[PDB]
Symmetry: D4
Subunit: 190 residues, 8 copies
């Protein structure tokens, strides 16, 4: 996995999709904006679009909010944008290996640059466990609070600037991977 | 109704100076800053050896330390010092395990603990009233929240996209609630989005 | 002259306790700080079941909500509680669609909604005065701006580059403005350069 | 054959600075932003080039040409000039508000060519006001900001509404710089509403 | 008999606001600062006095008279007008730079009296430029700030030097507002040096 | 001492002094400035001066720096400005009840509004003890560090905003009374 | 002299992936942010059960906890991981009480504690060098200070009127010094004026 | 043209290790961040006895100090180390009081002071160019200002009201300026309104 980690990204990736549009895949808000600026300076906007993981997750969610309001899931990962990876909750997953490839397909329809949309069932306890572990790695005390549709980790203790900062970065780290759909975090007020 | 006007008035003297069973003088300041000022005064007129300055926050700390040792199980809230010579102590009704008799002993132990107090009133407060008032206060304040009951007590997770001006308000309410109730049963947390 | 001399030099009372037509006591505070502190006092002494705290901003909100349901098409500004027993309600002349008949009827429901209010005094205000006052105050403070009409009312885009103070004084003026007029007509915005 | 075009436009192999010779026997070094500009300006100072070399960036050149248009074309409805190719600046004028004629517009082109010693030419392209405002809205949405549009004399304003988180504000700030770099501020404006 | 004078000048029994009638059949309410002004302005609005009453404060009146002097006395070397007694504004002109004559200065007085409907009179006092600059230095020292003086055309600048602590900066800010309220900014300036 | 504490101050005090000048005694920087502004609007500056405890301490120090460079002392208190109270270090005080009234007198000369200048010998251990006690009242952990000409209280621990703030106010409280001539405080850097 | 160029170079790969005696993979990130990124990667490609991410700061915490229990008296400084597979551990010479033999055991215990390490070098560093370099670094940085020796070690009280830009520099140096030396022998504090 | 093309597109080396005439190695860093990190590296590997880190700003300070003693009346700007083996020293033509003879002598002492320097190249700079460059850069950035001469040199009081950005860009420009010229002649100040 030396490879995978020292693996070197191309900053933008231009991906013709099934609708004749070229998609340009960016890695963060800043690059999105910039590329989105190039497209307008060159009259490409009728022919290309800029995408990133965060915006597509939001878009997909919006759709899911309507046609799958019941679905129990985490996030979509676009490391390989030609095969997005959709993380679903195994323990609350209520669909036949039929219906899941119906889901897959419908998401494919939403993403013209996707060749296939991979579905992957994730473990509800793995989600929550890794939140806990991370909290210890970054040395923040906490208390866990189960509830109806998830788990809350109320980060506690007195908290310095730095101690506020580190917790903020970790929470974004965790959110980048898991979303805030199962686990949410919160700071306690003393 | 006339009582209200009294409770609610610019009448009270600034500081209030209590004689103590321990032959020390207690001066009751109303807040941190006033306390610091009193402390300064004593130091200048050399009373620091005969008089002591107190306030609600500090005394609650001290009573708490003590209680950690002598009543480590007590389900309680806060001691109020509106009348510093008759502190009023709020315990949970629902979670109170003592007898009518055990409580007067408490009252007395606390009386002893507070050499300036004449008595130490004890009022069993209603756990439901406590969370009720947190909830009503959040609504009063248009601050959306989610209620999570737990083992210790209740955590109100404050939610929503959070404005600057709406953060400061939340902090301010939460302080208000703690002053009255303490933090031992109800907790407030702000959710990270 | 002297009429004014007093109005300005008045020593408004910090809290005013007012029995209402629903038997409850109503304590009227000048701002959110006093509201919290009062709301505190009522908690400590078991008034909470008997009395309530009110303030201009909160009441304006609560009443907005009720009007949202039973008068959703109503064009108004804000409610002034300088005299809480007689709260003045500023309505728009120019967008008024109601007989002297229909008025007083509203006046009476609003009266219900405010047990402390003996009577609610509706007053017809001039859309031109509303806008004209923003226009003037903006010059007094020396803030360049541009007017943009809409459905709803007016948006005053505050223009020009802006100091930390040019920003501040502007934030203040606007607070003063909204205190008087609400933000349902005239809007304020800071332009981005 | 575009896509290979996109590819080269998003290329990062493009040289930081670019030295261009001008008809005025001065050398123009095109920097890409304020920091680089200040860097090159510093390099020139130290090695005594300040007299025969000059640094330019799109922001500064947009101000100088604007001062110029203030005097010679004081009623021109335009947007901004782009310097992605400093040898061939492109200048966006509005179609719907352009009062000039084909040949008149080639005059303009010539005078700007003259005003920019280092340019081979100056491309004028007419732009659709509807596109300008359309792009403001779409990006405002892509950025998940609630807003109210306001038409007026010199174009359109977008009043940015909502209670606005700290991070939501910086998000709006960033997008608006972005919008301005492309379209300038002369037609579309953005404001943050005070609540 | 002064000291009893000092005593009454430092008195805190003085009424917050002051209503004064003007020759223009408007009423001027003199507030003492921006906040009070905004308060009274709010009280007037609510009780419909906006048409016959107006709020004034020394800062706003100094700007209005300055606009006026820009046109009618555009070379006058002056400082500020003081409104400790709104019925008798005092106006500090420089002695050493005053070109006017005794009677000329009573003209000025009359025109300002006219421009300020609510004043019984307008006291002109000539002031010593050396005093102005002298007071800048002394207070700069009392405030324990290192500085360099710079003479120039329109007076004197005081460049505030030193590495400056956060609290030392706010200290300088405060003292300079203070200096400005009394002497205005038209002669003495203050700058913070960049290191 | 109910009196003494609910005792109500006059904001400014006008005190004719032995040099024919009127001194106006203010309680803080802000009031100083304002009164110092009144004096200039009324041409009193040739006849009055504004004073406060902080500026006079600084002035006196400057003098002491020259004629008593050896002196071991804390601060001067001007609660009663007609009798300033000078706190000296008993344990490092090396002067005869003669020389002390010579000191007193010389300070009197510096302060025309002073009728007499009171000297009061304070206890080196009282200074330092009260620093320690205060640190506990305000619940800040610390370590004490003796040295050549004093004592340092390195406030330690992780420190919140609030926890930074409270320590700052207390340190000013203590300094108002004792000066930073014997005890200095410091925050540790983690 | 050629060695310098190596130490000092943009050569090194980003992460470095070590096989461990415990049949887990160790990835060595160089800083917090890189660590967080690695952690993210593993989570996505599901290696979180077979590979672990490490860095100098975290490992020093862990070794410290351990040592608190098994060598509670040790006078030491910090472990460096420039070569993650040969950690170098710095102990005090002056305050070292162990024999040549006791130290190799240590080395070994630590070796065991670090399943990815090949060896664990031990270098006795000079207490004087340690404070020397703090002092030289403060001068290097024109940041006036006062040196206070104590029981634990040495506190350099940073002094003088303190600029904003000079605070940030001080913090930055102090971080630099801790990275190399830790905080166990030399401490920095900022004096309050 | 091409001369420039390169100068600008150069890939300056991050650290340059340079043996000196005193046998020590000198590592030359571009800025304070790299200096710290390097200074770190030298600590870890026992170079500290052999090598040193230098940077333009620090060296400028150190050399200022030496000049303070043995040339206290010298009118100069700053030392440029773009090529450290040949550091250029900008002196003032207009205030030069020295023969070609006396120069080279200085050149040689400076050479001593910098074991890494093969030769120190003195260069006579134009007081008018010094000032004129501040004048120009100030317009480029669009910052209103006023000039005030003195004993010493020029103070450019930056005038006009100021955004958080008008402030910033101004703080930057000035840094760029001082990088090139030092602050011994031209001064910069922000006017207070």
């Amino acid at each position: 996995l030396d490879s995978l980690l020292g693996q070197e990204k191309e900053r933008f990736q231009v991906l013709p999709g099934r609708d004749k549009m070229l998609y340009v895949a960016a890695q963060n808000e800043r690059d999105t904006l910039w590329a989105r600026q190039v497209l307008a300076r060159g009259d490409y906007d009728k022919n290309a679009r800029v995408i990133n993981e965060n915006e597509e997750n939001k878009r997909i969610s919006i759709w899911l909010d309507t046609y799958y309001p019941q679905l129990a899931y985490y996030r979509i990962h676009f490391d390989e944008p030609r095969k997005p990876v959709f993380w679903l909750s195994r323990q609350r997953n209520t669909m036949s290996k039929k219906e899941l490839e119906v889901l897959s397909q419908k998401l494919r329809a939403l993403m013209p640059y996707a060749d296939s949309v991979n579905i992957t069932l994730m473990d509800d306890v793995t989600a929550a466990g890794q939140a806990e572990a991370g909290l210890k790695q970054q040395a923040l005390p906490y208390s866990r609070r189960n509830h109806k549709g998830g788990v809350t980790f109320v980060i506690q203790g007195a908290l310095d600037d730095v101690e506020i900062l580190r917790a903020r970065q970790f929470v974004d780290s965790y959110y980048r991977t898991w979303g805030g759909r199962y686990v949410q975090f919160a700071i306690e007020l003393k």
